[PDB]
Amino acid sequence: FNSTQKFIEDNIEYITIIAFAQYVQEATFEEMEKLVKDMVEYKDRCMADKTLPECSKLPNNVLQEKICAMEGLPQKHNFSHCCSKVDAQRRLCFFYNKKSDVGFLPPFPTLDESLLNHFLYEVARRNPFVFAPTLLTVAVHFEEVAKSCCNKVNCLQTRAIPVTQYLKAFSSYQKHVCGALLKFGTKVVHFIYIAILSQKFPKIEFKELISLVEDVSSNYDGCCEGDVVQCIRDTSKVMNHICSKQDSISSKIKECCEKKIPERGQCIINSNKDDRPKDLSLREGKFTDSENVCQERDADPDTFFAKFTFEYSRRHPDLSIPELLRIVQIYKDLLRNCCNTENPPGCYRYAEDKFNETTEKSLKMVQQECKHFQNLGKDGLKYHYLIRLTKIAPQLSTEELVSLGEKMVTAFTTCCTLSEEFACVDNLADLVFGELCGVNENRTINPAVDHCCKTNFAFRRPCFESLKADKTYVPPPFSQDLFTFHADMCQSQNEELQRKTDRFLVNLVKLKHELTDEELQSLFTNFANVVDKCCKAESPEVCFNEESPKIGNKGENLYFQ
Ligand SMILES: *[C@@H]1O[C@H](CO)[C@@H](O[C@@H]2O[C@H](CO)[C@@H](O[C@@H]3O[C@H](CO)[C@@H](O)[C@H](O)[C@@H]3O)[C@H](O)[C@H]2NC(C)=O)[C@H](O)[C@H]1NC(C)=O
Ligand SMILES: *[C@@H]1O[C@H](CO)[C@@H](O[C@@H]2O[C@H](CO)[C@@H](O)[C@H](O)[C@H]2NC(C)=O)[C@H](O)[C@H]1NC(C)=O
Ligand SMILES: [Cl-]
Ligand SMILES: [Cl-]
Structure with a gap:
């Protein structure tokens, strides 16, 4: 204090x-x-x-x-x-x-x-x-x-x-947690931090973990409101607590705990996951093997599921936080069905197959996504995400769509080469859809997106990835000048030239929202080829107006659809 x-x-x-x-x-x-x-x-x-x-x-x-x-x-x-x-x-x-x-x-x-x-x-x-x-x-x-x-x-x-x-x-992680607190309440923040801290501090004991999660949860109630003083006090209290029980929590935080406020806390947050205890088994069998699971759940459901999350997360340092939470929910739902049947021990016995099934499906998905990144490069993959994002959320501003697309591809640029790409990709990509859904507001984009934002925290990313094009979309008029190229486009400019290209693509997908993703990608490559050629020419101005693909459809010259 x-x-x-x-x-x-x-x-x-x-x-x-x-x-x-x-x-x-x-x-x-x-x-x-x-x-x-x-x-x-x-x-x-x-x-x-x-x-x-x-x-x-x-x-x-x-x-x-x-x-x-x-x-x-x-x-x-x-x-x-x-x-x-x-x-x-x-x-x-x-x-x-x-x-x-x-x-x-x-x-x-x-x-x-x-x-x-x-x-x-x-x-x-x-x-x-x-x-x-x-x-x-x-x-x-x-x-x-x-x-x-x-x-x-x-x-x-x-x-x-x-x-x-x-x-x-x-701030991306803080906003994701605060957004989750507003939309889902404090219970979900608790389960996020059970997963995170259990994964990061695998040798910690359950009782000390739950104590620490309560401290972190209270830190978030203050910090998310914007109460700066209380956020400093509650953050110090978290770090005091961790550093006082250091040898029973993490052997990776020695140097951090010797630092002062507030660098101490930031070092601890940044520290590497501690190694798994030598004696820690590959699985905790009481959640599936015991015949008394349903009564252990019934004795204290929130504590029972907290214990499950603790025991599963500290043994799986290679899962993302969303994947751990999906697993918790799958286990919860499996017991909701099982525990009212004639033989509950029967159906819950093989819960680990459901867990392995979803984890394998998710890993495959990330492998496929990183292969596309390798094949296409950063820009190539950015254009694919700009098309998809604009198709599902066309009511967003073009500036925001471009930002969201840039953030989505940076997940792959950061994660795909690293050891444990799956965790990294899935953790970072979840933050992108968090940004979409709002921090301190419930946003109204379109009904299908709003349903993904608000229904279920852990299944948010796969909800979004299953969305088809927003068929409710009525676009505003777009002026012809959004799609015209100027001589300034022909130089080795900064990444504000990349932002101009991205804006063009997003606006194009809005204008031509009824075309397939393939047709939009083809049309876009046509425009890019014309910019590559016209930028080598004398007087690129005239070249662009006499080689550019038509986007309108005659008798419609200043404002397109
Ligand atoms: C669910 O999937 C997990 C992994 O995705 C499966 O775990 C594998 O289980 C086998 C035997 O139960 C483990 O064998 C052990 O391998 C180590 C290798 O270092 C060896 O030293 C031990 O003596 C032992 O033979 C294997 O390690 C483990 N695989 C991984 C990647 O950890 C599990 O079988 C699946 N469970 C169900 C119910 O489907
Ligand atoms: C945004 O949505 C959240 C989630 O429903 C709203 O939170 C609820 O607020 C009511 C009272 O206004 C409470 O009875 C619920 O318990 C709250 N739910 C949760 C999960 O906390 C919130 O009010 C909305 N905010 C705005 C500005 O619309
Ligand atoms: Cl911010
Ligand atoms: Cl601190």
Whole structure:
């Protein structure tokens, strides 16, 4: 508690900036400095004589009251609805005020302890759900990278790509878990963390595991709401707990546990899975071999299924978290049928065959996907996913479809060569569909997608992969200029030329949504061939208009279907 209390008081400036910038993404840096002043005053007035009326209140309620008391702010950035509520309803309104879609903001500025203040402000408002320990550790990595630049501005933009990659990996997992908490409730977060921690810390004992999962679950309730102070406290408490029982949890965290807040926690999260105990059997037979499974379930169902997840997950370090959860659900459903029959021990005896069956099906699928990646390359496989994604979710904006497609192919670029490609691919690919379904909102894309988002956490990815083209789709008009090529397209440009190509393909699939995937891929390759040839020509402009495939159908020139 007391080291954590010191850390919070010493970093109150950074923490205040994170909270306000995440909650009110439109607020300016000058307004951040206003709230920093008022929060530093609050800190001092509490240290000097704690016994005050305002010192008793929770730090998120205090922060939100002072945001709500700023002259004109609620109405200026459209959050007066939240200030007109109080307490839990206000806190909930502020959580709902966050926008994952940060297109409305400009590009990220070029920096040349105000540097950290500015970095934190600019990162936090663009990543409104990322937890504070992650963000404060990202900034410490930015200070080191900044300082290793003696064109020192362009030195900083390069070299920050690994820092940015560290941020997005963490926030992608945090958003997936928070999204799951909103849509499915705390029970599912518990089962996610039973699987994760059991897999990562296989020598841990069940009772200590369940204790640790309760701590992590409470950490997520605070962090997902956006309560930065509580998130720092609850995260420290998780890491204190792990480091105090270190030799009974993991032999891989020695160096981590010697570090300070908040690097300690990030090291632990990043650490490798601990090795399986020598004496750990290949299978725990009591879930299938015993004749008393149904009564053990009936004595305490949630604890019984938690124990199953623990015992299965620590023995299967090569399954993804979604695959473990699918296995839990299959075991649960098998016992729901079996335990009301005349001979329950009979049908549940071979549950491991159902488990092996689904695992084999999933592994085959990933093998096939990685073979397509090897055959086609990154871009080739990206175009296949852009077509499929646009077919099933054509109501999404083209920018979002392109982002989702880029994230989907990066799962394969990261995972396919590695040992244990199956776990890596399936874990990363699950995050992509998580992004699709929303963090702090229930999104309305189309009925079939909405059904996959909301019905079942563990079976979400395979639900989506079984969807056919959205036959409900009525496209808006598209202007001809979306499909025209300009002379600027003919140079060795950055990956904003790749984003232009991706946008073209997505818009094309929207326009021509009734064509087959093969016909769309053929039409797209026709356009690419024409750009390859016309970019070698003198005057590419005229070449494109006299060699491009027709997309319209005569008497229809500015606006297509
Ligand atoms: C379900 O699938 C699993 C694996 O996907 C099957 O596990 C295999 O079971 C056999 C015998 O039960 C294991 O044999 C052992 O192999 C090790 C090799 O290091 C050897 O040292 C031991 O003495 C022993 O012979 C085998 O390891 C294991 N396979 C794997 C990959 O772990 C299991 O048979 C399937 N269960 C059902 C009910 O279908
Ligand atoms: C988004 O969907 C979730 C999932 O149904 C909603 O959560 C439910 O909220 C009601 C009361 O409003 C509770 O009775 C349920 O227990 C909640 N379910 C779960 C699983 O937590 C949530 O209200 C929706 N949010 C919005 C803004 O529409
Ligand atoms: Cl975020
Ligand atoms: Cl920590």
